[PDB]
């Protein structure tokens, strides 16, 4: 079974976050995916070790 | 996140694979309702089968 | 106290060996530091009923921290002028003639040639040199020793000790980061309108964490506190070169920091 | 688990917490008490008592209005600590003279 | 991975070392280069679990990302004009090879266990530098190193029969690899005990397209390579901050793309403007647009010098008439005033003078690490042979390393005994014979001058001995056996 999910952002946000912490923002989305699809995961598991 | 070293993996290399079982049986019908195991954790009880 | 920084518990004991020995000294009827260079000397003046020092304690803590910032400046101004061509080369050149190192020729090396207790210890002394430099991997490193200390102005390195049994688990210097300790000295005495003590001073040092990542400065932070060690714990040297006044020690590139910019 | 940031590593208490804390066994043993030696009470010298259980820096409020004590979490950073102070100007002293009598 | 197994397992048995010991009480890390940071409580070892996916993840995006574009632009500095004629210099100093020869070659002169060792360790040596192909590929293989200032090679293991699985190895390009440490240990107020660190590697395939464009597919990526199990050696260079291993070349970085774009600055001066340049101008007003186009046209399309100098020929397009000795050309006046003309353009006037570009050529030659020879014994000359042998001496671990590797792996020393042993054993590099013997030649003809001049005296006042010692700088040995030879030639 699959797990996925987009980054849903655009050009003037990255435009500001430039100018005010000096984040490109994409890589910032992506690890930001990465890391709710391993520990949802994670979740999966525990939860069903828990019910079954 | 405690990620796979409580549950095992068995990771692969394509989608969808199936894995084997082995029961000892007892009764001439491997295959029926009523039909017996040989062995199992919860019982291994029946001395009375090549027996009385 | 109760010495919760257990790392440097020896070098603790090396250092209250030393400062009790200045508590025992006649340097009394003195009005100047008594100090040419080296760590920061500042008034924290006690064991009075004045208590002046909490001024200074206030001072180093909410004006936290110049002294290493334009030291930070300083360092990588240093840098970004060896950066460029022939400020390049004229470093290589004074580290290469500082240190001088090819196939079977001699090494910085320890020359006994004045009056010791005994031959024996002549040996034994040449042998521990032989592995300061091999701690330093200074058959192989030293010139880059050499250049942080001529360049970013100082050199430094930790002690490390056992500690079970301190004054045999003797081990190899751990290279310090520049820009990441704080020399001090603190002078913790007073007497009729003004100290006129000893001041011993105690010389020990601090050092500030850090994690820079791609930063190249402490962008978002360094690594919020830094630890207060005995400097019996600490190696270090510098170059007799400082700002106008204090204890504002600069490289020796940076009398060139001007032209070069 | 409500910072989302790691565990307590601090306490400030009271005189009587802080007089327990000293007093006792805090290892983990059967049981016991006696004499306080495990810390620093005396605020005359400290407000660091020392580290309870190697694990929560243990401070003393000479101040403390009644009977009670708090803990909390600071991280390695100076933003990760909930609380913060930030100086602007500081320790700044002001001289001078009143022109009409020279008064200091 | 499996694959790497028993290089794990000697980077397991190297950190248990490190934790067996007492390498506590230290505040900042126990590191002088390479890997970048992590720090973890022991973790799940089985593969690179989300701790492992940051650490290479913020290692990558906001790392390999421009550890990439300073790969990419110490190339394009590799492959200018001039620039690659020093690294080549460079480059050759440090390789050479001459007609039957030796080449790199280990020199066992220091105490050893004993010669038939000595002798295994020459045998593999020599399997080592033919496993670098060295005698074909020795100069590509500084010169990649050189240039990008990390070279990595897989290393080859069998592992059923793991004492003969030393083989060719496999080098690794710059820009798929990255050197990863991590932390795991911990104490009050900040981790000041055993940080074994690890430093292992990263490699991946990936975005495989830049300077050739590349096809691939969206997969992921990310491998883990123990330390055990890669041969490699880098330059002493590092930025402001972190561990990032900059190129030779990085000081030329500067100047190399100033002069280039000077140099394009006077190429673009000389070509533009060169063509005869010229604006017909009349009046329309108060006219149809597609009527006081005729005005125009009647000028535009029949005062056009359709006369072009062939770039590619010594010839002239349409020239014929063979040249006309005037170029005959007009414009009507339809006002009754002196309203129209064509105007002429500023031409490619001669004002160079090019002299910038020799400044910032010279300023840049110094950039590239070379001596002003380029374009007897010299200080430069010496200071190059002293960056040379530095090169060298960095570029040699390449040769030790699978060189300890199958030495031990097979089982002929210890580690124990390497650690020992070296103490500098080191591997010497062929150097050019011609340069050495005019080296020596000066340094002859310098000690006979200065026998010459001492002679008058060196029966009565200076001993012979001591010329001998002090002028010619003869050992005692080397006198004693010299006067033993001179005696039997006498007789």
Same mark, same amino acid.
């Given at each position: 079974?699959?797990?996925?999910?987009?980054?849903?952002?655009?050009?003037?946000?990255?435009?500001?976050?430039?100018?005010?912490?000096?984040?490109?923002?994409?890589?910032?989305?992506?690890?930001?995916?990465?890391?709710?699809?391993?520990?949802?995961?994670?979740?999966?598991?525990?939860?069903?070790?828990?019910?079954? | 996140?405690?990620?796979?070293?409580?549950?095992?993996?068995?990771?692969?290399?394509?989608?969808?694979?199936?894995?084997?079982?082995?029961?000892?049986?007892?009764?001439?019908?491997?295959?029926?309702?009523?039909?017996?195991?040989?062995?199992?954790?919860?019982?291994?009880?029946?001395?009375?089968?090549?027996?009385? | 106290?109760?010495?919760?920084?257990?790392?440097?518990?020896?070098?603790?004991?090396?250092?209250?060996?030393?400062?009790?020995?200045?508590?025992?000294?006649?340097?009394?009827?003195?009005?100047?530091?008594?100090?040419?260079?080296?760590?920061?000397?500042?008034?924290?003046?006690?064991?009075?009923?004045?208590?002046?020092?909490?001024?200074?304690?206030?001072?180093?803590?909410?004006?936290?921290?110049?002294?290493?910032?334009?030291?930070?400046?300083?360092?990588?101004?240093?840098?970004?002028?060896?950066?460029?061509?022939?400020?390049?080369?004229?470093?290589?050149?004074?580290?290469?003639?500082?240190?001088?190192?090819?196939?079977?020729?001699?090494?910085?090396?320890?020359?006994?040639?004045?009056?010791?207790?005994?031959?024996?210890?002549?040996?034994?002394?040449?042998?521990?040199?032989?592995?300061?430099?091999?701690?330093?991997?200074?058959?192989?490193?030293?010139?880059?020793?050499?250049?942080?200390?001529?360049?970013?102005?100082?050199?430094?390195?930790?002690?490390?000790?056992?500690?079970?049994?301190?004054?045999?688990?003797?081990?190899?210097?751990?290279?310090?980061?520049?820009?990441?300790?704080?020399?001090?000295?603190?002078?913790?005495?007073?007497?009729?309108?003004?100290?006129?003590?000893?001041?011993?001073?105690?010389?020990?040092?601090?050092?500030?964490?850090?994690?820079?990542?791609?930063?190249?400065?402490?962008?978002?932070?360094?690594?919020?506190?830094?630890?207060?060690?005995?400097?019996?714990?600490?190696?270090?040297?510098?170059?007799?070169?400082?700002?106008?006044?204090?204890?504002?020690?600069?490289?020796?590139?940076?009398?060139?920091?001007?032209?070069?910019? | 688990?409500?910072?989302?940031?790691?565990?307590?590593?601090?306490?400030?208490?009271?005189?009587?917490?802080?007089?327990?804390?000293?007093?006792?066994?805090?290892?983990?043993?059967?049981?016991?008490?006696?004499?306080?030696?495990?810390?620093?009470?005396?605020?005359?010298?400290?407000?660091?008592?020392?580290?309870?259980?190697?694990?929560?820096?243990?401070?003393?409020?000479?101040?403390?209005?009644?009977?009670?004590?708090?803990?909390?979490?600071?991280?390695?950073?100076?933003?990760?600590?909930?609380?913060?102070?930030?100086?602007?100007?500081?320790?700044?002293?002001?001289?001078?003279?009143?022109?009409?009598?020279?008064?200091? | 991975?499996?694959?790497?197994?028993?290089?794990?397992?000697?980077?397991?048995?190297?950190?248990?070392?490190?934790?067996?010991?007492?390498?506590?009480?230290?505040?900042?890390?126990?590191?002088?280069?390479?890997?970048?940071?992590?720090?973890?409580?022991?973790?799940?070892?089985?593969?690179?679990?989300?701790?492992?996916?940051?650490?290479?993840?913020?290692?990558?995006?906001?790392?390999?990302?421009?550890?990439?574009?300073?790969?990419?632009?110490?190339?394009?500095?590799?492959?200018?004009?001039?620039?690659?004629?020093?690294?080549?210099?460079?480059?050759?100093?440090?390789?050479?090879?001459?007609?039957?020869?030796?080449?790199?070659?280990?020199?066992?002169?220091?105490?050893?266990?004993?010669?038939?060792?000595?002798?295994?360790?020459?045998?593999?040596?020599?399997?080592?530098?033919?496993?670098?192909?060295?005698?074909?590929?020795?100069?590509?293989?500084?010169?990649?190193?050189?240039?990008?200032?990390?070279?990595?090679?897989?290393?080859?293991?069998?592992?059923?029969?793991?004492?003969?699985?030393?083989?060719?190895?496999?080098?690794?390009?710059?820009?798929?690899?990255?050197?990863?440490?991590?932390?795991?240990?911990?104490?009050?107020?900040?981790?000041?005990?055993?940080?074994?660190? &690890?430093?292992?590697?990263?490699?991946?395939?990936?975005? @495989?397209? #830049?300077?050739?464009?590349? !096809?691939?597919?969206? /997969?992921? +990526?990310?491998?883990?390579?123990?330390?055990?199990?890669?041969?490699?050696?880098?330059?002493?260079?590092?930025?402001?901050?972190?561990?990032?291993?900059?190129?030779?070349?990085?000081?030329?970085?500067?100047?190399?793309?100033?002069?280039?774009?000077?140099?394009?600055?006077?190429?673009?001066?000389?070509?533009?403007?060169?063509?005869?340049?010229?604006?017909?101008?009349?009046?329309?007003?108060?006219?149809?647009?597609?009527?006081?186009?005729?005005?125009?046209?009647?000028?535009?399309?029949?005062?056009?010098?359709?006369?072009?100098?062939?770039?590619?020929?010594?010839?002239? &397009?349409?020239?014929?008439?063979?040249?006309?000795?005037? @170029?005959? #050309?007009?414009?009507?006046? !339809?006002?009754?005033? /002196?309203? +129209?003309?064509?105007?002429?353009?500023?031409?490619?006037?001669?004002?160079?003078?090019?002299?910038?570009?020799?400044?910032?050529?010279?300023?840049?030659?110094?950039?590239?690490?070379?001596?002003?020879?380029?374009?007897?014994?010299?200080?430069?000359?010496?200071?190059?042979?002293?960056?040379?042998?530095?090169?060298?001496?960095?570029?040699?671990?390449?040769?030790?390393?699978?060189?300890?590797?199958?030495?031990?792996?097979?089982?002929?020393?210890?580690?124990?005994?390497?650690?020992?042993?070296?103490?500098?054993?080191?591997?010497?590099?062929?150097?050019?014979?011609?340069?050495?013997?005019?080296?020596?030649?000066?340094?002859?003809?310098?000690?006979?001058?200065?026998?010459?001049?001492?002679?008058?005296?060196?029966?009565?006042?200076?001993?012979?001995?001591?010329?001998?010692?002090?002028?010619?700088?003869?050992?005692?040995?080397?006198?004693?056996?010299?006067?033993?030879?001179?005696?039997?030639?006498?007789?």
């Amino acid at each position: 079974k699959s797990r996925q999910l987009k980054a849903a952002y655009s050009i003037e946000l990255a435009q500001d976050l430039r100018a005010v912490h000096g984040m490109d923002a994409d890589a910032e989305l992506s690890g930001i995916l990465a890391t709710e699809i391993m520990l949802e995961i994670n979740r999966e598991v525990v939860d069903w070790i828990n019910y079954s | 996140l405690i990620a796979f070293d409580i549950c095992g993996v068995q990771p692969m290399n394509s989608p969808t694979g199936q894995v084997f079982a082995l029961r000892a049986v007892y009764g001439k019908d491997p295959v029926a309702a009523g039909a017996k195991e040989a062995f199992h954790p919860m019982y291994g009880p029946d001395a009375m089968f090549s027996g009385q | 106290k109760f010495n919760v920084l257990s790392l440097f518990a020896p070098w603790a004991k090396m250092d209250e060996r030393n400062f009790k020995d200045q508590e025992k000294e006649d340097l009394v009827s003195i009005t100047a530091p008594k100090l040419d260079d080296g760590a920061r000397e500042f008034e924290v003046s006690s064991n009075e009923a004045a208590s002046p020092y909490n001024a200074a304690f206030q001072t180093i803590f909410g004006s936290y921290e110049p002294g290493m910032k334009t030291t930070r400046e300083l360092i990588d101004t240093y840098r970004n002028l060896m950066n460029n061509y022939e400020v390049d080369n004229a470093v290589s050149e004074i580290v290469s003639d500082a240190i001088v190192y090819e196939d079977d020729t001699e090494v910085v090396a320890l020359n006994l040639d004045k009056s010791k207790f005994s031959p024996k210890i002549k040996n034994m002394m040449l042998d521990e040199f032989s592995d300061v430099l091999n701690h330093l991997s200074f058959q192989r490193k030293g010139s880059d020793h050499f250049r942080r200390w001529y360049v970013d102005s100082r050199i430094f390195f930790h002690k490390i000790i056992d500690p079970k049994r301190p004054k045999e688990g003797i081990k190899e210097l751990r290279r310090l980061d520049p820009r990441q300790v704080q020399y001090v000295r603190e002078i913790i005495t007073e007497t009729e309108a003004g100290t006129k003590i000893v001041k011993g001073y105690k010389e020990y040092f601090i050092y500030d964490t850090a994690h820079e990542s791609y930063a190249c400065d402490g962008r978002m932070y360094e690594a919020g506190t830094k630890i207060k060690i005995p400097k019996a714990a600490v190696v270090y040297a510098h170059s007799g070169l400082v700002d106008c006044c204090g204890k504002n020690i600069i490289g020796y590139l940076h009398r060139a920091v001007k032209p070069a910019n | 688990r409500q910072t989302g940031r790691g565990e307590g590593n601090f306490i400030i208490a009271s005189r009587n917490v802080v007089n327990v804390l000293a007093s006792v066994d805090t290892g983990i043993s059967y049981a016991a008490q006696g004499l306080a030696t495990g810390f620093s009470t005396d605020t005359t010298k400290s407000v660091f008592a020392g580290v309870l259980g190697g694990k929560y820096r243990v401070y003393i409020d000479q101040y403390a209005k009644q009977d009670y004590f708090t803990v909390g979490y600071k991280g390695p950073n100076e933003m990760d600590a909930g609380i913060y102070y930030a100086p602007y100007v500081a320790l700044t002293p002001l001289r001078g003279s009143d022109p009409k009598n020279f008064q200091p | 991975l499996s694959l790497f197994a028993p290089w794990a397992k000697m980077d397991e048995r190297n950190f248990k070392d490190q934790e067996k010991e007492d390498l506590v009480s230290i505040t900042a890390p126990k590191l002088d280069d390479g890997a970048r940071e992590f720090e973890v409580s022991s973790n799940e070892a089985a593969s690179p679990y989300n701790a492992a996916f940051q650490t290479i993840f913020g290692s990558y995006e906001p790392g390999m990302k421009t550890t990439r574009e300073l790969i990419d632009t110490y190339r394009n500095l590799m492959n200018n004009y001039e620039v690659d004629n020093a690294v080549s210099e460079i480059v050759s100093d440090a390789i050479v090879y001459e007609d039957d020869t030796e080449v790199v070659a280990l020199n066992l002169d220091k105490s050893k266990f004993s010669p038939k060792i000595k002798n295994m360790m020459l045998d593999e040596f020599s399997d080592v530098l033919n496993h670098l192909s060295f005698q074909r590929k020795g100069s590509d293989h500084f010169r990649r190193w050189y240039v990008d200032s990390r070279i990595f090679f897989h290393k080859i293991i069998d592992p059923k029969r793991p004492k003969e699985g030393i083989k060719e190895l496999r080098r690794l390009d710059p820009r798929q690899v990255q050197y990863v440490r991590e932390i795991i240990t911990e104490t009050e107020a900040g981790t000041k005990i055993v940080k074994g660190y &690890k430093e292992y590697f990263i490699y991946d395939t990936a975005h @495989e397209s #830049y300077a050739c464009d590349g !096809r691939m597919y969206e /997969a992921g +990526t990310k491998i883990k390579i123990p330390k055990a199990a890669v041969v490699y050696a880098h330059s002493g260079l590092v930025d402001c901050c972190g561990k990032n291993i900059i190129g030779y070349l990085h000081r030329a970085v500067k100047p190399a793309n100033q002069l280039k774009l000077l140099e394009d600055a006077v190429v673009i001066y000389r070509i533009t403007r060169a063509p005869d340049r010229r604006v017909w101008y009349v009046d329309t007003g108060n006219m149809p647009a597609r009527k006081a186009a005729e005005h125009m046209q009647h000028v535009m399309n029949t005062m056009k010098n359709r006369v072009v100098y062939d770039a590619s020929t010594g010839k002239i &397009k349409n020239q014929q008439h063979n040249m006309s000795m005037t @170029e005959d #050309y007009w414009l009507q006046r !339809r006002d009754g005033k /002196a309203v +129209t003309e064509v105007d002429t353009l500023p031409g490619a006037d001669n004002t160079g003078n090019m002299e910038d570009i020799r400044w910032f050529r010279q300023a840049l030659y110094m950039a590239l690490r070379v001596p002003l020879s380029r374009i007897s014994i010299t200080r430069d000359e010496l200071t190059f042979a002293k960056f040379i042998r530095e090169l060298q001496h960095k570029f040699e671990e390449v040769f030790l390393d699978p060189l300890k590797t199958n030495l031990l792996l097979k089982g002929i020393i210890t580690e124990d005994e390497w650690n020992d042993e070296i103490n500098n054993i080191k591997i010497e590099f062929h150097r050019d014979s011609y340069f050495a013997e005019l080296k020596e030649a000066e340094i002859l003809e310098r000690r006979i001058n200065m026998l010459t001049m001492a002679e008058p005296f060196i029966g009565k006042y200076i001993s012979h001995r001591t010329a001998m010692k002090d002028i010619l700088q003869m050992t005692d040995e080397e006198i004693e056996q010299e006067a033993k030879q001179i005696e039997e030639e006498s007789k």
